RNA sequence: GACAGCAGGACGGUGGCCAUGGAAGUCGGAAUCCGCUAAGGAGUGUGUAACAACUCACCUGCCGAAUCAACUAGCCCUGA
């Protein structure tokens, strides 16, 4: 199993990753453009890829990471073409997705259940943070629900 | 800081007394933050582990608000690392031997004990080079296809003998399994009792 | 601010003995005897104890300067107490360079000799002092061990050793070479 | 090459704080130039490595 | 202020002139420390223009009196509090003085800023003198010589400056 | 039950965020929370180009009662 954490395009513009690749020789480029095909349509931004091997494979499992789909979550696709106003838009709700998130938050948080992650995935934002009409200093004090119907 | 902080400490100690009256005596000289949080959510359905400051020293006080029996008896266990384990379940004596989890190979140097780490001859995956560390050390090495083979079979590290950084990085890059420790359990307190673990608990 | 008196407080073993004439301290033991002279710093040494041992090293007013100096007596009291008992071991690994240094021994321990020495050709001979042995150590590789009872005599003798063993009107980052003292101790283990 | 014999020699010829008026070599601990050439000043900085 | 030889306490009391505006001045009250007690009304002078609105000729001195010591027998704690003039500025400073009486203990007190801080006697103004008792005193001295069943010996005694003739065959042995 | 001393820990979200010549705390720009908690500062520095090791704030075991910081002015020293 191999780890690699980037994405914008595909690239292959004489650049990969394979250091520990060449020694079981599956991957020079068909197992990059078969992480084309895996990457394809989710999304044009950064991602996390595991890619696991048995002698002549490549299975490109992709761990959805908490801050990798909150940045997912904006208003897609901005990749090139007219980018750059600015950075830091960011005007979403988010009201139950991040409580679907945490829910496919499996065995990385090491967390209690589902009590004060509200808190964790309100303040570990920024780009977005609330819906547009309160604020998330006083969601860190706000409404206690989900951790009953989580479990 | 450190004054209302410290008050409710104490709120926080005398609900675990007035809450669970009976508690386990623990050990914990070798033992990592990552190694405190897998052994935390593998015990969050029941027994909480609580260390501390000399705070701990608290009974007396606990003692002083007339109250209790005669719970004075666990005041010089709490000696050299002491933490207490409060549980109200058990009842019930399989409690850690059946959860006491060896750790997932931490290496660190600074370790001597207990045993000897050998190397057998196994091809072992390594890239190019990962040859440094074995000239530095000493170790004769042929290389096959691709992974690279050990010739001979010898004894990096003995008993007593200090690990150090060179010889951890390749222990961790061989990943034969390193020098791995958790807690020790030294002491059963259930009800008013004495217990004397040599042998008579579980 | 003229502060009344500081006492110092000394057990002394079973193993050695302590006579005392006024300021001259005389400590007599299995590995020799020593004494030294405590002349220029007046201050009160008295004893105690019938077959207890316990000095006290006593000042009365004096300064600030001198309640520092009157640790200083107890301090050395102890380093002849553990010279006495234990003796002193300097163990001096030659850290050495492309070119080796061959150190030899010439006139029963007392005359360490030099040689090789960077590539230097000049064959340097230091002297020691009266009551400290040298020798090449065995089962491990160019370690000099200095044995004696007397601190000051044993490691000003590494002392001059180490400056003896000097790169000189060179960078002494790079070259790193001379005979430094590796581990300090005494000379009979367990203790 | 014996790299804990080389941090030996570094231990002993390297790891010192320089003082920036004195030029002296003093302590890795230090806080003032020992010497009175300069006023026991604290202007110290250590001692530059590669 | 001179401050020669030992000092002394004055009580001096003053008052304004009876005037047709303001009849019967409040008759103030100090504690003025002197050699003697001209230096005294003049000091007190001093202080109470200061102070408030008055001078010698618009006033009064009713009466200048020695104060003697309450308990001259018992060795006794002072808190001196004063606002010397430095050379570069004034500052506020609190020291304390084991000694017999108030008078003696003040003279330590101007011997003694004369001494550390070359403060002159143009310089020194007693704020406040106030004995003070045991566990309540602030330095380490003071402190240290409160002690019962205390014992030192006199080291190194020397003295007889050509009491004895300057030309002899001794040598002398101290203590 | 502090100051110094010795020993141990110094995490999870998160290789967070603006960047891609790198940033995975360590050139830089904006910030700034929660959990486990014995405690960890989206990090005080050293580094390997970066990925990693080391260290510090903070925490705990022994020790044992005073300790630390910033100013100020008298003598003396450097500046001379
Ligand atoms: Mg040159
Ligand atoms: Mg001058």
Redesign the interface.
């Given at each position: 199993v191999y780890l690699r954490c980037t994405g914008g395009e595909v690239g292959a513009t004489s650049a990969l990753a394979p250091k520990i690749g060449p020694l079981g020789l599956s991957p020079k480029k068909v197992g990059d453009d078969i992480a084309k095909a895996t990457g394809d349509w989710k999304g044009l931004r950064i991602t996390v890829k595991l890619t696991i091997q048995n002698r002549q494979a490549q299975i490109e499992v992709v761990p959805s990471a908490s801050a990798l789909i909150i940045k997912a979550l904006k208003e897609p696709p901005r990749d090139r073409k007219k980018q750059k106003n600015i950075k830091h838009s960011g005007n979403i709700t988010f009201d139950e997705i991040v409580n679907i998130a945490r829910q496919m938050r499996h065995r990385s948080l090491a967390r209690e259940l589902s009590g004060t992650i509200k808190e964790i995935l309100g303040t570990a934002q920024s780009v977005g943070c609330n819906v547009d009409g309160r604020h998330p200093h006083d969601i860190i004090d706000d409404i206690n629900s989900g951790a009953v119907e989580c479990p | 800081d450190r004054a209302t902080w410290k008050s409710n400490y104490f709120l926080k100690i005398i609900q675990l007394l007035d809450d669970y009256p009976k508690c386990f005596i623990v050990g914990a000289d070798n033992v990592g933050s990552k190694q405190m949080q897998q052994i935390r959510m593998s015990l969050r359905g029941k027994a909480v582990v609580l260390m501390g400051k000399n705070t701990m020293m608290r009974k007396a006080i606990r003692g002083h608000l007339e109250n209790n029996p005669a719970l004075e008896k666990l005041l010089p266990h709490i000696r050299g690392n002491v933490g207490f384990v409060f549980t109200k379940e058990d009842l019930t004596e399989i409690r850690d031997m059946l959860r006491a989890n060896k750790v997932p190979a931490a290496a660190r140097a600074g370790a001597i004990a207990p045993c000897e780490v050998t190397v057998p001859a196994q091809n072992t995956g390594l890239g190019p080079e990962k040859t440094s560390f074995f000239q530095?050390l000493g170790i004769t090495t042929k290389i096959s296809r691709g992974t690279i083979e050990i010739l001979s079979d010898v004894q990096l590290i003995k008993t007593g003998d200090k690990v150090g950084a060179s010889e951890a990085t390749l222990l961790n890059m061989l990943n034969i399994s390193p020098f791995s420790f958790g807690l020790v359990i030294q002491q059963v307190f259930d009800n008013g009792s004495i217990y004397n673990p040599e042998v008579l608990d579980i | 601010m003229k502060t009344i008196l500081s006492n110092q407080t000394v057990d002394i073993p079973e193993n050695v003995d302590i006579t005392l004439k006024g300021r001259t301290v005389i400590v007599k033991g299995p590995r020799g005897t020593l004494r030294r002279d405590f002349n220029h710093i007046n201050v009160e040494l008295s004893l105690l104890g019938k077959k207890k041992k316990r000095l006290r090293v006593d000042k009365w007013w004096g300064n600030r300067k001198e309640l520092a100096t009157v640790r200083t007596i107890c301090s050395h009291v102890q380093n002849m107490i553990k010279g006495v008992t234990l003796g002193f071991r300097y163990k001096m690994?030659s850290?050495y360079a492309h070119f080796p240094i061959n150190v030899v021994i010439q006139e029963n321990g007392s005359l360490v000799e030099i040689r090789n020495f960077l590539g230097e050709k000049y064959i340097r001979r230091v002297r020691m002092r009266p009551g400290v042995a040298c020798s090449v150590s065995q089962a491990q590789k160019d370690e000099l061990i200095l044995e004696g009872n007397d601190i000051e005599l044993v490691s000003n003798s590494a002392a001059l050793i180490?400056q003896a063993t000097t790169v000189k009107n060179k960078d002494?980052?790079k070259f790193?070479?001379?005979i430094?003292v590796?581990e300090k101790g005494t000379v009979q283990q367990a203790d | 090459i014996?790299?804990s014999?080389?941090q030996?020699?570094?231990k002993?010829?390297?790891d010192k704080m320089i003082c920036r008026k004195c030029y002296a070599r003093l302590h890795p601990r230090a806080v003032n130039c020992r010497k009175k050439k300069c006023g026991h000043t604290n202007n110290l900085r250590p001692k530059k490595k590669? | 202020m001179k401050a020669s030889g030992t000092l002394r306490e004055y009580k001096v009391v003053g008052r304004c002139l009876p005037t047709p505006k303001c009849h019967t001045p409040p008759l103030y009250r100090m504690r003025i420390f002197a050699p003697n007690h001209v230096v005294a009304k003049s000091r007190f002078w001093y202080f109470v223009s200061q102070l408030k609105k008055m001078k010698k000729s618009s006033g009064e001195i009713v009466y200048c009196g020695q104060v003697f010591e309450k308990s001259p027998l018992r060795v006794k704690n002072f808190g001196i509090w004063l606002r010397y003039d430095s050379r570069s500025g004034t500052h506020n400073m609190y020291r304390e003085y084991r000694d017999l009486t108030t008078a003696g203990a003040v003279t330590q007190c101007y011997r003694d800023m004369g001494a550390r801080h070359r403060a002159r006697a143009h310089s020194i103004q007693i704020m406040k003198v106030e004995e003070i008792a045991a566990s309540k005193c602030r330095r380490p001295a003071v402190k240290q010589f409160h002690d019962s069943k205390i014992k030192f010996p006199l080291p190194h005694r020397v003295l007889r400056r050509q009491h004895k003739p300057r030309f002899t065959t001794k040598r002398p042995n101290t203590f």
């Open positions: - | 530095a | 690994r850290v180490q002494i980052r790193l070479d001379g430094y590796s | 014996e790299p014999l080389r030996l020699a570094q002993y010829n390297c590669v | -």
